[PDB]
C-alpha cells in the first residue's frame, strides 16, 4: 500500500475473428429462477486468500461435449446466450448478457457470425471481465459488498444450465476496491421473478453494452496492476465445497 | 449542477468530454435517469454503431450535436416522472469511463 505505478498502456486489441457485432438490440432476460420441483442448482465456491487478489468463477461447464452432440446431429449451426446475475432473498440483479448466433459446431464454443456486444452491470464491468473462454469471470480486488450469489445462465443450443458460484471475501475491501459512485450506487436493481416473468427486464434498458473480453480485459488487467495487482497466469477451477 | 423547467416545455441537458486526454479512445456516450436508485438508460450515442432512445422517450429525446466529446440531449415535453438525476457517461479505453450528473426538477405551472 498505498500507490499508484507506471504500468505500459496496453492496446486495443483486435477481434480474435471475423463477425458481425449486433448493436442495440434488446430483449427481456429470463428469469433466473427455476420451480422449486427441480432438483438444486450445482454450487461451487469462489473466495481470496487476500483482499487486492484476482478472484475467479469457473465452472467448465463441459460445452464441447454439447457442440459435439450439434455434429453428430449434422446440425449446420447453434446459437448460445450466456447470462449472469446476483441472487438475493426475493429478486435478483442482471449482471452480464451475451448472445452468439450462427455459430460453427465443429468449432470451439462461440465461433459465431453474429455476436451483440456484451451487455454489463455497470459496476460489475469496473473491476470484472470474462475469462478467455467466457464462460467465467474474473474479479479484480472486488470490495466486500460484492460477496453473495452469483448464477450463471448457459443457453448452448437449446440446453439450459445454470452454476451457482458463492464468493466470500473474508479479507475485506482491498484499498483500491471500486465501491461505486454516489451515494453509495454500486449494482443495477434487484428484480423480483414477477418482473422476469412479464419480460420488463429489458437488456438494452438496464444493462451496458460494453467492450468484448479481451479489450475488457486490458482495461481491468491496466486498472489493477496500475494499483499494483498481479494478474496470475491461470486460475484454477471454482470448488464444490465450502471454504475453511 | 440542478435544472429546472415547467411541465409541457423542452428542455437540454448538456453533456461534454474536455479535455480529452491525450491516448484515451471514446467509444460512445450514455445517458441514464437514477430512481431510488436504480439506473435506467435514456438514450445511447455510439459513433460507429449509431443512436437508440429508450422507451419511454422514444419520441422526446434527441441529440443535438451527438460525436464523441457531446452527448448533449432535447428532453421534450416534460412530464413529472421525468424528475430526477440524470448521468451522462462517456465509455473511454484504457481509462475506463467518466461521468457528470445533473439533478432536473420539473415544477407544475
Ligand atoms: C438462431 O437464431 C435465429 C434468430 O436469432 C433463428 O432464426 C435461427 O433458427 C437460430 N438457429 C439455431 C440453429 O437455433
Redesign the pocket.
Known sequence: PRVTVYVDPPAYPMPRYNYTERWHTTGPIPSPFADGREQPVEVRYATSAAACDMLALIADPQVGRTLWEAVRRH?????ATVIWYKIESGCARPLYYMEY??CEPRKHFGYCRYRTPPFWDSFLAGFAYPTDDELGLIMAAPARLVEGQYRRALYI??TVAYTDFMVSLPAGDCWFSKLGAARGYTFGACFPARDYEQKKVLRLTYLTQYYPQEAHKAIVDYWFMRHGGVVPPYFEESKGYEPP | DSMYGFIGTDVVLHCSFANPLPGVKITQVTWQKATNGSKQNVAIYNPAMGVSVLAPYRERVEFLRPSFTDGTIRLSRLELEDEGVYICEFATFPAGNRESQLNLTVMAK
Open positions: 446440425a449446420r449451426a447453434y446459437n448466433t450462427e443450443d437449446g
